[PDB]
């Protein structure tokens, strides 16, 4: 007999305070014993949590958020930002025919060494009183738009470091700034970043995450 | 018989003819 489910500890997860309610959920690993036990084997965890779960607003039901466990004290797993991406059903909802898709991408680092790749998506818009059925762009508007996206995203990163990058990523204010900067070139339907991925990270920096948590 | 297989059979047969003339020359 082994019955492995009787030697687990039921730890708890805490989000970083650049969100609403810190309660995420529960985890469990193994009994702490000799020979390099689970004091560190519980470190490398990533939790997928809905942004509506983290903010209590139903209209954030997409944009699922990564949270990476970085340090553990007591019965508490402190997590930091690890990435973001849209939900697949939301993506397939935006991507429809008789319109042009613009997908831009940048790789930039914040004030600290948080190098990270920001994506972005947009779709051309059928304006009012449009008899025309498709409303495609001219591949030069597309290039101009993608240039503006890259400029804006690089402007928003490498200043306003990761903590307040998340704090302004939550209310969807960046894509509004795209809406202002690109409304003169070509109308658009759905501007989003659609994904943030962290590439590599600096030294552990215990103070940053003890600053976020508490 | 299918035309492309007739062509393949003829090509093999022409290979054989060229080899037999190679024996004599």
């Amino acid at each position: 007999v082994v019955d492995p489910f009787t030697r687990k500890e039921w730890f708890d997860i805490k989000a970083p305070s650049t969100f609403e309610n810190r309660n995420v959920g529960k985890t469990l690993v193994n009994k702490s014993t000799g020979l390099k036990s689970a004091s560190d084997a519980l470190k490398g965890r990533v939790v997928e949590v809905c942004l509506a779960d983290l903010q209590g607003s139903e209209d954030h039901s997409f944009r699922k958020i990564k949270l990476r466990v970085d340090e553990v004290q007591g019965k508490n797993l402190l997590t930091n930002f690890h990435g973001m991406d849209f939900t697949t059903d939301k993506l397939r909802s935006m991507v429809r025919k008789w319109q042009t898709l613009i997908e831009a991408n940048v790789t930039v680092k914040t004030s600290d060494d948080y190098v990270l790749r920001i994506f972005a998506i947009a779709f051309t818009r059928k304006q009012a009183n449009q008899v025309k059925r498709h409303s495609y762009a001219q591949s030069s508007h597309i290039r101009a738009i993608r240039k503006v996206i890259s400029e804006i995203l690089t402007k928003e990163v490498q200043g306003s470091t990761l903590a307040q990058l998340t704090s302004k990523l939550i209310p969807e204010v960046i894509n509004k700034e795209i809406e202002n900067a690109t409304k003169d070139i070509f109308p658009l339907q759905n501007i989003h970043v659609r994904k943030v991925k962290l590439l590599k990270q600096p030294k552990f920096d215990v103070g940053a995450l003890m600053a976020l948590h508490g | 018989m299918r035309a492309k297989w007739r062509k393949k059979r003829t090509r093999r047969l022409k290979r054989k003819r060229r080899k037999v003339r190679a024996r004599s020359k």
Partner: protein, 127 residues
């Protein structure tokens, strides 16, 4: 106030997987498939087998602690059919029968931007 887990229903053809893990996913709770309870070798993907597997999932889920789940429905994906098998709906059906609470249902089919030429040949699977 309810403890959450992840369902991770992989409903291919030829089989269905109901594979509950924690909210993170390194460790698992009661991975049971349709093929370990039907001896047909061909009913392994049947909705009945999937519903039985989900019931065994919930049976071992209780007295382990999970009470609600987020749902990740998966097809074979990649170059293959990328459509859910017949047992996925039944497995989710039975997980919701057995008292386990449901939230955040999503599809996790691996969808490729073209890669890895599909099997079957140029003329396809000729039947």
């Amino acid at each position: 106030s309810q403890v959450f887990g992840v369902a991770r229903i992989y409903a291919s053809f030829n089989d269905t997987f109901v594979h509950v893990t924690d909210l993170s996913g390194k460790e698992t709770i009661a991975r049971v498939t349709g093929g370990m309870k039907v001896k047909a070798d061909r009913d392994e993907s049947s909705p009945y087998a999937a519903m039985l597997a989900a019931q065994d999932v919930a049976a071992k889920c209780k007295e382990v602690g999970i009470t609600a789940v987020h749902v990740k429905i998966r097809a074979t994906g990649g170059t293959r059919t990328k459509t859910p098998g017949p047992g996925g709906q039944a497995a989710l059906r039975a997980l919701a029968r057995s008292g386990l609470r449901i939230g955040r249902i999503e599809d996790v089919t691996p969808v490729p931007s073209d890669s890895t030429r599909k099997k079957g040949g140029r003329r396809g699977r000729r039947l």
